[PDB]
Symmetry: D2
Subunit: 391 residues, 4 copies
């Protein structure tokens, strides 16, 4: 039976919408995190067989941004590279697909994760037939391909409203969660707890280079009071807001995968062993519920009980969905997103899953936690989870 | 573990802005997913996941593979995703699904690709705003589909790079291009695309239309019409519109499950996937990709090139295809025996699935035991897969 | 003494169908041909022109001051001046009045005035300086936004036409009859050769070959009442205004060469007529189709003429509804109005149309020996313009 | 012989490109100016017969923005309104066209001037035929329709270079002229000499309203070094720079006209009598020279010697051309642009002629100057000039 480990991991800092990485292509963030995982494990880029990168918004970035990130990071032309999209779950799914390359004896060494620049996502219009008369729409690919449900036509925060309404979650419980997430994240940030996992990214300029190594979306000094001031963002009589939903963000995150025997040959002390993963579908109207069956399915594959977990990363798309998952699964809230979650840190879609996985792995190392789980809800109604055990 | 293609279908390939000009990728996809399941006698609710290659999803809305999956009646309980190894995606998707089943993560996968090159939008990054001066609206089909990221030239320059390395004449490529069209029109009229094709109904306020014939194929392709073309990518070059593939829309897919499961279901499978591989090569000469990827596939399959009874070798260009034939040295009589992509079309993300459909349906038709399918990929890669009939 | 300005010569292009003969012909190219024509027809050299004044509503993307481009192409010397203006549909006729003014005030002696438009070449646009930080945005059709949508109510000109239909209680059958009659008069005029004199042929250059355009391509031959009756209302589901009883989207240019009556006489020119009066008046934007009514009345007052004194009238047909309303109110003999058909048939190249219908008026007055004529048009945003012309 | 007076005048402050009026439609600036001239004259909007506004870049603003300005200002629906374009000359030419309406007996009271929002000018593409395959250009209407010569394809700054070379104008002379403009305009602004002309414009905003009543393009404390440091903008061995050229700017300006008799009936002390005007063509290659023949012709028509002039506003498109004009005409530089010119104040194309007219009229009144001239050069090779006498 195969046994495949995460030798090393790294992520950029998460940028704010049109913030520090306003003009930085996804593959540029990508390339930095690929070299980082390689440098962090002591493996030469020339030893990478394949690079697999989750990416949702690749339009106008040119052929196969995954190969562009690979090549820029000095992975040789002889390797291969590709991109995939299971939306919010992409960056974590790519890690599982990579494990599969190795488990099936198709590859010995894989870099997998996700990259996303929501800033650089273009506006678009189908224009071949030509517009003989009348206005036409220039469509925001970020919104269209990222945040709009393809079946109901409404946005993801409307699905959060559905989940909020199902689980009867008050504005106050969602806001209390929100401020909790920010507070946890600003603590982690100041306490230095993101330094291990973040690789500085340098933003080249004519005016001068700017090194980015801090998560800029975290609100310092978030108060309940500030939270309670905001209007509902998707339903005039709704409870979801910009304060209790994640944001629009840019980042990359990756992990270096290989067999347990290989890490041991190379003297690598891996960050974890992938014991299981799972993906499952649910109603797109309540996609926030995804992590409930996916986590349960991952745990079933891992042969674990929910109580076995020492650390969880359950992605925070919206406070409504996040509370609901925590409610349903019944895991100790104190072990969930202990350094804050996406509401504070941001949600760079295709990278999110590799982002939270990074956070899980380094905090597991940090606390000496043995068993851990990452899970995300996925637009269109899915969830993905992955179980990790320390070596 | 032993994973078989239970069934397989593809849409006809449409010419650029032709039959499918205003058809979303995911609708062509939904037709192919349903057709695989119907042909296999498998309930859609039995499907674990749908994996679709697609290179050009801008404007089409969240995760078009799931939109196809849902439009095909696969329940909300299944999963779906898209992937891009450019021209390899459609075949890579099938490898990826086989892995899902090999690792015990799924029982039944629908894998393939879908593309609408006609529906690809123009785009510009516009958040920062253009404070003054002109800007370019970018054809995402060209940028994200056929333009090499590293050198910034089209895929037709690479083919010229390969024409000049393998020293392939303009005569030879026209000999190849006419030969391809002839086979495709022969095969078409002969009724050899019927099995693999599932018809697609294009809905309209003027009337529905049923597309069930490949429309990019030229009838009565003469060398003259080839030799009358000017070079498209270099003023002194040998690559042309006639000895290169087209821009196209279409979809293709396979139903995967274990061999054991196919036997519980009493399904007579189209083939057993014996091996596959992907490999990298100089992006400048990307069309060579099928060489290392077919050799690895074959080494991984424990086969010799002399073992193959049939090969499908994607003709992105005549120069890259001739060169692969030249180096691999297989019998050119068993290669693309019903024509190729120059004749048929190259719907980027579907193409690997396309050429698999053709490979599998013709191995049945003539009773070939072994087949290899292979593609070159923008940026310099090759994918290949080895299919043994049951 | 009170100045007397004549129209020494006039010309127009054939009017092109939307995305038709002139699909890719910039407006100033049409204009250049027409400027060349009026000079030729008057025996006046381009070197003698003082100013060119061209109405033009949709100049976006054509570059700096397309009037000047038209003039320079036509060989008008760099020492002359040229400018464009925009009083919407009224533009081409107002230009002619503004030309007259230049001469009357002693600032010029010889002016080419009229208008030009390429609706087909009108671009789509969007303001993108500040970025679109998130969310979809519209690429606006400049033709629709700047030419055909009311700026105050936000609806299209055809809704204003519905408004007039309703106020004047004009039936669908009445409007349809008017529109068929327009088509049939224009077809008849065309087949008889009555537009030859006014039309200067336009050569559309290509690579595949040149094509000479000298027929109005929008006129429907053999137009049937059934063809009109079958159409759905285009602006109100329970309305009466249709694509068939409205004018179209068209390309074209048209112009007149002006000079003092004394200067014409020196040169030995037999002018097409004397400008005796003009006027422009405003009305409610909601019923802008009504502009011709006060504009005409004022023009006549200023001329010292009664409605009954008119021998010919060109009253522009933006829509059958407003056309009918104007004729009903003014009470002029419909048999003297748009005798060669009107815009429903011929087309409506916005900034050119006033000069176009002036062309038609002048050449018909000449043809039939009519002494007194009037040209009038309604104007988007609630205005009218009218000019009175007398034979000399 | 008819005698037409300018009863009153007003202008907006001139905004910087994408500055104070970045999102203000030209017709909103024009309305405020229309309301102002009416206020200043004591004439009610009900009395206005026609509004005539020069405007070079109306694309996307809707039907006949002149009418939109007139209606917003309360000018009755029975009045009429129209736009015109003779490029830079347009605001001034509008005033002459107004004059003509009165002189020929067609109107009694006219508001004429110009308005321009270079900021709001869109980008455009002809898309009716479709673009079957390949990239296409989105054209900046501001550059295309406002600033590029239609015959030679180069920008107006290249015309200014042509004039530099022909008149042998050093980069030092041009920089000195531009510094002097800035320093004159700063002085005038600090002394309050633009207050009388400027009508404040309220920029409405959710986050509050902003009152704009100072010319924001004027550089305070402009140094010769700052000019000397600049690279030539139009030819690598050129002399014309962003510093010795005017800018891209927003604004409106207008004058209310009536007959001298009508003003006397109303008891109005007018800003000046229109004594003459002229417009002439020159080679487009050297369009900056237009003022030369235009001014000479206007002076001839007025029966005035250049020496007779007490004040001159000669528009400063570029230092090069402004210097050539002054050299040729020979008028005392100390009477020209005494409060600075466009290089400092800005160049809102279709309003600029009316702007400089405003500045002339208010300074003539201020200093008791009897005879004034306003002149501008015009893209495509023309000039326009106007002679004004105090009453
Ligand atoms: C008003 C417009 C042009 C947006 C529209 O509704 O579609 C236009 C059609 C399809 C009705 C077309 O037949 C048409 O051009 N109708 C006339 C439009 C129009 O207002 N023309 C100018 C009349 O003054
Ligand atoms: C002239 C233009 C706009 C094409 C250009 O060179 O870029 C703009 C800059 C930023 C370089 C700068 O020189 C500028 O603002 N130019 C505009 C100069 C101009 O035409 N001014 C009008 C003078 O009346
Ligand atoms: Na505003």
């Amino acid at each position: 039976t195969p046994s495949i480990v995460i030798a090393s991991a790294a992520r950029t800092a998460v940028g704010s919408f049109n913030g520090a990485f306003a003009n930085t292509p996804a593959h540029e963030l990508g390339a930095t995190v690929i070299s980082a995982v390689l440098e962090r494990a002591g493996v030469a880029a020339g030893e990478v067989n394949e690079v697999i990168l989750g990416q949702v918004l690749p339009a106008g970035e040119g052929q196969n941004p995954a190969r562009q990130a690979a090549m820029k990071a000095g992975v040789p032309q002889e390797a291969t590279a590709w991109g995939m999209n299971q939306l919010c779950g992409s960056g974590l799914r790519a890690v599982a697909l990579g494990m599969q390359q190795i488990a099936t004896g198709d590859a010995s060494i894989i870099v997998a994760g996700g990259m996303e620049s929501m800033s650089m996502a273009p506006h678009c219009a189908h224009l071949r037939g030509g517009v003989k008369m009348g206005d036409f729409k220039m469509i925001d690919t970020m919104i269209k391909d990222g945040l709009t449900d393809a079946f109901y036509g409404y946005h993801m925060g409307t699905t959060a409203e559905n989940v909020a309404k199902q689980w009867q979650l008050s504005r106050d419980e969602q806001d209390a969660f929100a401020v909790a997430s920010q507070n946890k994240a600003e603590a982690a940030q100041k306490d230095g707890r993101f330094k291990d996992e973040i690789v500085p990214f340098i933003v080249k300029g004519r005016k001068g280079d700017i090194t980015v190594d801090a998560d800029e979306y975290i609100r310092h000094g978030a108060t309940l009071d500030s939270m309670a001031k905001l209007r509902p963002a998707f339903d005039k009589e709704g409870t979801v807001t910009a304060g209790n939903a994640s944001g629009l963000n840019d980042g990359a995150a990756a992990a270096l995968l290989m067999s347990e025997a290989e890490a041991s040959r190379r003297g690598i002390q891996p960050l974890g062993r992938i014991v299981s993963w799972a993906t499952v579908g649910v109603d797109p109207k309540v996609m926030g519920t995804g992590p409930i069956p996916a986590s349960r399915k991952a745990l079933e594959r891992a042969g674990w009980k929910i109580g076995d977990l020492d650390l969880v990363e359950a992605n925070e798309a919206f406070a409504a969905q996040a509370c609901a998952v925590n409610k349903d699964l019944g895991w100790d809230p104190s072990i969930v997103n202990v350094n804050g979650g996406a509401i504070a840190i941001g949600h760079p879609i295709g990278a999110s899953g590799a982002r939270i996985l990074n956070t899980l792995l380094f905090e597991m190392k940090r606390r000496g936690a043995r068993k851990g789980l990452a899970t995300l809800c996925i637009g269109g109604g899915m969830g993905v989870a992955m179980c990790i055990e320390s070596l």
